Amino acid sequence: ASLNLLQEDQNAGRQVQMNMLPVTPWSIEGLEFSHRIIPLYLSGDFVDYFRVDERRVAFYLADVSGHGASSAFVTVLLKFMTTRLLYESRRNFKPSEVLAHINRGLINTKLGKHVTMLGGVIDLEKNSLTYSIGGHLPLPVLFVEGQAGYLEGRGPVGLFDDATYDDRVMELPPSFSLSLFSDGILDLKEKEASLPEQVAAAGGTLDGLRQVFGAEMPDDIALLVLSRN
Amino acid sequence: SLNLLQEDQNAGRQVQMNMLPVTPWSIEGLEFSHRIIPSLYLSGDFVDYFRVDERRVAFYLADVSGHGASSAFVTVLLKFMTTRLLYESRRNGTKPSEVLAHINRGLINTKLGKHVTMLGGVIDLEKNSLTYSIGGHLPLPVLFVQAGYLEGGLFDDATYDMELPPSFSLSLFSDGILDVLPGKEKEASLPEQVAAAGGTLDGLRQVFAEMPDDIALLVLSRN
Numbered sequence: 168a169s170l171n172l173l174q175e176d177q178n179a180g181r182q183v184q185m186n187m188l189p190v191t192p193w194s195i196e197g198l199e200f201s202h203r204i205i206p207l208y209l210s211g212d213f214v215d216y217f218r219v220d221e222r223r224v225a226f227y228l229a230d231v232s233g234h235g236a237s238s239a240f241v242t243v244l245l246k247f248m249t250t251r252l253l254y255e256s257r258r259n260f261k262p263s264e265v266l267a268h269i270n271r272g273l274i275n276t277k278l279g280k281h282v283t284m285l286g287g288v289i290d291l292e293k294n295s296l297t298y299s300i301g302g303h304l305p306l307p308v309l310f311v312e313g314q315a316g317y318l319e320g321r322g323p324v325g326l327f328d329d330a331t332y333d334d335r336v337m338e339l340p341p342s343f344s345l346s347l348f349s350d351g352i353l354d355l356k357e358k359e360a361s362l363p364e365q366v367a368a369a370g371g372t373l374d375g376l377r378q379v380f381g382a383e384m385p386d387d388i389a390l391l392v393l394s395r396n
Numbered sequence: 397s398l399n400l401l402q403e404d405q406n407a408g409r410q411v412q413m414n415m416l417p418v419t420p421w422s423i424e425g426l427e428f429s430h431r432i433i434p435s436l437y438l439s440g441d442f443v444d445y446f447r448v449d450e451r452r453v454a455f456y457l458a459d460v461s462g463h464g465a466s467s468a469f470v471t472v473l474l475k476f477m478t479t480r481l482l483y484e485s486r487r488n489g490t491k492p493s494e495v496l497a498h499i500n501r502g503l504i505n506t507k508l509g510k511h512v513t514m515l516g517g518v519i520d521l522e523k524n525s526l527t528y529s530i531g532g533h534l535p536l537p538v539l540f541v542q543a544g545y546l547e548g549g550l551f552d553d554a555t556y557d558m559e560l561p562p563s564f565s566l567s568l569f570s571d572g573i574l575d576v577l578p579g580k581e582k583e584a585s586l587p588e589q590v591a592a593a594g595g596t597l598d599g600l601r602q603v604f605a606e607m608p609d610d611i612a613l614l615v616l617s618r619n
């Protein structure tokens with residue numbers, strides 16, 4: 168079947184991204200990392216979290232412009248740049264500077280695609296969380312004791328040559344649950360921004376609640392939940 | 397259903413159409429021309445060639461494992477690494493094998509089951525010297541003057557490793573070969589033969605399907 172072969176070609180691209188993303192649930196030093204990406208097979212949403220010298224933990228949720236194959240190639244680039252930077256530190260950092268490097272790579276006529284991502288670096292020893300948002304995507308929702316709210320911040324998404332990126336630091340309670348979301352919200356533009364903050368609270372902050380969803384979605388949907396308690 | 401996926405597949409095709417240089421493009425007497433014929437829209441075969449301080453020129457022909465979307469992702473990766481390294485290098489410069497190694501380190505460990513097969517070459521315009529470095533088992537480049545092969549990476553190993561005539565025409569080829577003939581070893585001694593008796597230019601490559609494997613060829617000519 169003609170459709171058969173191209174669908175085989177598409178699932179070869181989906182199968183290839185599954186290996187690229189880390190495993191879940193993955194817990195270290197009390198922090199549990201869990202992600203759920205729901206792709207037309209090839210997604211523009213990609214989440215990645217890696218260990219750094221057992222002292223610093225980094226993670227991000229990125230969504231490339233639109234969806235499908237076109238944007239699926241950019242997620243490949245991001246995973247390369249990130250892991251590469253670590254090795255680039257040599258055998259022998261404000262995240263802002265990372266989103267900047269991510270930015271420079273995109274600008275050089277690289278498919279003319281821009282990615283919106285939320286970057287977060289956590290110091291395990293001093294319970295410090297330094298997050299840097301570069302996109303206009305729905306802010307992160309951290310959860311404490313039955314209540315949740317947005318960690319607000321402004322900006323460029325990496326399509327301008329001048330960074331102008333600003334990142335903020337925040338300390339972590341003994342029991343916390345940060346949640347990162349993609350463009351999809353259905354799971355009034357701004358009356359829909361208040362839903363996630365209230366819905367995430369009232370609902371089980373664990374990924375277990377997020378898994379319950381499994382007719383495709385207009386835009387790719389992907390979430391990352393970091394919790395410790 | 398199918399029409400939607402077709403429109404998504406065509407998007408990945410148009411993005412790679414601009415990703416590759418224009419043809420034919422000639423500099424200092426050297427004419428670079430390539431012809432990539434995808435089987436399923438998205439191809440694993442990618443060719444690229446760029447200027448380097450107008451003294452040295454780099455070119456390569458890559459074939460990622462298999463074909464389609466899955467392998468199409470790696471080509472974008474190769475395209476980035478190369479143009480980025482030149483921005484990294486700056487003044488000092490410093491070997492096609494050394495770059496074949498930078499590409500090597502990036503792919504392994506960050507990727508599973510998608511190794512690259514490449515024919516690397518850097519030519520010094522000033523002294524008429526071409527430095528070739530092959531890392532894949534793909535069909536050797538076919539020299540043109542009578543033709544002939546040139547003597548010559550998923551593993552952690554890094555074992556990756558000439559004067560040129562006044563008139564010459566080197567040609568790189570993919571793993572795919574259609575000879576419309578009845579005749580592996582005999583099909584490897586034929587390219588050198590068919591390439592000679594046939595017009596060395598892309599002109600002939602332009603005239604002449606689908607799978608099993610994607611087909612792409614790079615032709616560097618000088619006369």
Ligand SMILES: [Mg+2]
Binds near residue numbers: 232233234386387
């Ligand atoms: Mg999107």
